[PDB]
Structures are given as C-alpha cells and as structure tokens.
Amino acid sequence: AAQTNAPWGLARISSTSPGTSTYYYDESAGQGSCVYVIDTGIEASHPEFEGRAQMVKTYYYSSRDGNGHGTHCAGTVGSRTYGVAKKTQLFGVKVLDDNGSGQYSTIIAGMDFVASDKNNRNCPKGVVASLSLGGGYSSSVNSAAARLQSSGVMVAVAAGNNNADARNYSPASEPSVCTVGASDRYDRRSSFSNYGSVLDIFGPGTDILSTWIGGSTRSISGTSMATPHVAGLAAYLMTLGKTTAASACRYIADTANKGDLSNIPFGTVNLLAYNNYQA
Ligand code: NA
Ligand code: NA
C-alpha cells in the first residue's frame, strides 16, 4: 500500500533517505493491535479515527480532550491520513488536564490502570502504550513505566524537550521502556530534543501534521510527536508478527536507519525508526 503526499514523518519511516513524499506500508496496517494514548484524552468523534478510538478512563471532571495534545498524538499513531498504523484500536487515558499538566500520582495511577484494563480488551496482536509527557526525575514514575512494560505492554515515552541529557527526566530515564528522541525533515536532531545513553531510537518530531480538537488538524513540534511514530510502528510490526511487546524496542533499533542523523552528541544512538517495507 502507498499514501501519496503523506506528511513528511510517515514518508520518512518508510524510506532509507530523507525528502520523499510517499508512505509505503503493509495493508495489514496494525489491525488486531491496541495502542493506549495516556495524555489529555482523544476527540474519539474526529472523522479521522473512523470509529476506531474511544475514551476508557479519565482522572478529571470530563473525558473530553479540551487541549488538543492527546488527539494530535493519537492521530500520529493511527488516524486514516496522519497515522502510522491506520487500522489499530486507540484507547484514550486522560492523566493530563486541558492545560497539559498533571500530578505524578495521577500519571502513575494511569499506567497501572492500562496494565489491568488490557486484560478485558480484545487485542490479539498486542498492546502498545504511548506516553508523550514527563518532567523531573522520580523513581516512582520510572518504576510505574517499568511495571507497565513488564506486564506485557510495549511502552514508548518522550525523551523530553529541554535540549539536555534525558537521564534527569521521567519516565524518559527508565532503561526498560523505549525512550524516543525527535528528528526534523533534513535528518537533524530537533533543536529541542533530549539526548543521552538512555535514548533507544529517534522518530520525526519537528513540524508534524496530525488531528486536532473541533475536527481540525495542525502542525506542532516535540518529542511528544516522535513517540507516537514509534508506538504506531511497534503496533504495525506486532500485527505483522515480526516482534513482541517484550522486544519491539530492540527490534526497532536493530532494523533502524543507522548513522543518517546529524547533531547527535557522542554517546547517543544514531538510529531513526524505519518499517523496512518491500512491496
Ligand atoms: Na540512509
Ligand atoms: Na530503553
């Protein structure tokens, strides 16, 4: 299958070189897999989700996405036009309020909820969790991301947006999950992207077109936009039977585009997420 005039990020994860416009992907498209988006929620009713998204849990007064962030990240995972895995099942967990903020105890509660809730859903190809959030080091936030991963969910987290070593941010600094840096359309590290030894992989994160609230779309930048490229790719490869939740991050790093990125400081991986599609 091919999507012509795809957003640059989709095109980039199906190509060995930058500057193409076509997203080459197997027509299976993540059917049978589930991705939990733990964020500000999802506008489930966006025509771009085709009825494949629903809210399962909120920690606030409403389940509605009043922000747009969560809907953007959900769109890059599995919307029709803007998504990596175009036939995946999207579940929204709202741990962030409509200003994009949330206490660590609510974020911990949300990860433990997904570890339980996956057991009463139909996801034969497997479960991904996408966390486009973080702040300063907490051993509790890390420990909870480790519990979600250990329970059999592929966990993708944002490296963070401070142009700093990700080692001082959670859940970014938790070794056992998949920590995602951001690249731009010329194969440069996004100027805001965290780096360091703890990073596993880079995705597209600068000028990413995806879904937004009120049935709209817009372009935003961040490791928040890169993370769902990787969660999507993991759901996609799990549907193909090429890897499992336990080892998807390591399989994505093995099969990645090597050495193509610039402004990668010594000690950080030069690995860019790639689906390895052959028609
Ligand atoms: Na290359
Ligand atoms: Na890791």
Curated annotation (Swiss-Prot):
GO terms for biological process: proteolysis. Ca(2+) 1 binds at residues 175, 177, 200. The chain holds residues 106 to 384 of 384 of the full protein. It comes from Parengyodontium album (Tritirachium album). The keyword Membrane does not apply. Disulfide bonds join 34-123, 178-249. It comes from the Eukaryota. This is Proteinase K. Binds 2 calcium ions per subunit. Belongs to the peptidase S8 family. Keywords: Calcium, Disulfide bond, Hydrolase, Metal-binding, Protease, Serine protease, Signal, Zymogen. The keyword Ion transport does not apply. The active site is at residues 39, 69, 224. Ca(2+) 2 binds at residues 16, 260. Residues 7-279 form the Peptidase S8 domain. Its cofactor is Ca(2+). The gene is PROK. One of its GO terms (molecular function) is serine-type endopeptidase activity. GO terms for cellular component: extracellular region. Its EC number is 3.4.21.64. Hydrolyzes keratin at aromatic and hydrophobic residues.
